[PDB]
Amino acid sequence: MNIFEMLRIDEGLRLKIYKDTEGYYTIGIGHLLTKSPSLNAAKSELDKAIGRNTNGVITKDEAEKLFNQDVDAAVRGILRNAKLKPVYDSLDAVRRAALINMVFQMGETGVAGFTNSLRMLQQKRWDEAAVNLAKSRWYNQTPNRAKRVITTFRTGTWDAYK
């Protein structure tokens, strides 16, 4: 198990524009295209992202390319963020993937807002951090996925993904 296989499990793979759990046009492995309700606006984002006139449909190779960029963007978002980087630096490799997962799902700004959970993670109070993480819109809206990520923070193992 690693961050790519982990996010692949959580995001699925779909080759045509679909709507994510919030109703936002998305494609590939969880690649958010736009929060606009215009399918046309989403298709324009897709053409721009891929670099060609798509029919709202991409290949698997293209979906994996956006995935690679997006994982890389999540890591670099963590490392540029003054609240996220110290927590990331403080974690082991498994829990680091759990943080990348949250940033991939919600963005750098959103996760950097989990101030109290971040402090408990940096303090390595895993059970407490796990309880605090669950007290969130994130947990309530995507509870099975949040449970998996939270179990990864709580245990420092991949048990939720096997």
Active-site positions?
11, 20
Instruction: Work out the angle between the directed axes of helices 126-133 and 115-122 (0-180°, nearest 10).
Output: 160
Minimum CB distance to Cl ion, residue 143 (Å): 5
142 counts as binding Cl ion under rule CB under 5 A: yes
At closest approach, how far in Å is the CB of 83 from Cl ion? Answer: 24
Site string for Cl ion, 18-57 (x = CB under 5 A): -------------------------------x--------
- Tokens 């046309």 belong to residue: 40
Per rule CB under 5 A, is residue 145 in the interface with Cl ion? yes
CB atoms within 10 A of CB 4: 15
How large is the angle between the packed helices 143-155 and 93-106, nearest 10 degrees? 150
From CA 73, how far away is CA 28, in angstroms rounded?
16
| Rounded least distance, CB 90 to Cl ion, Å | 27
The smaller minimum CB distance to Cl ion, of residues 53 and 115, is found at: 53
Strands 31-32 and 25-28: antiparallel
Choice between 21 and 123, CB closer to Cl ion: 21
SS3 state at 20: coil
**Residue 97 structure tokens:** 């993937």
Q: Given the rule CB under 5 A, which residues bind Cl ion?
A: 49, 142, 144-145
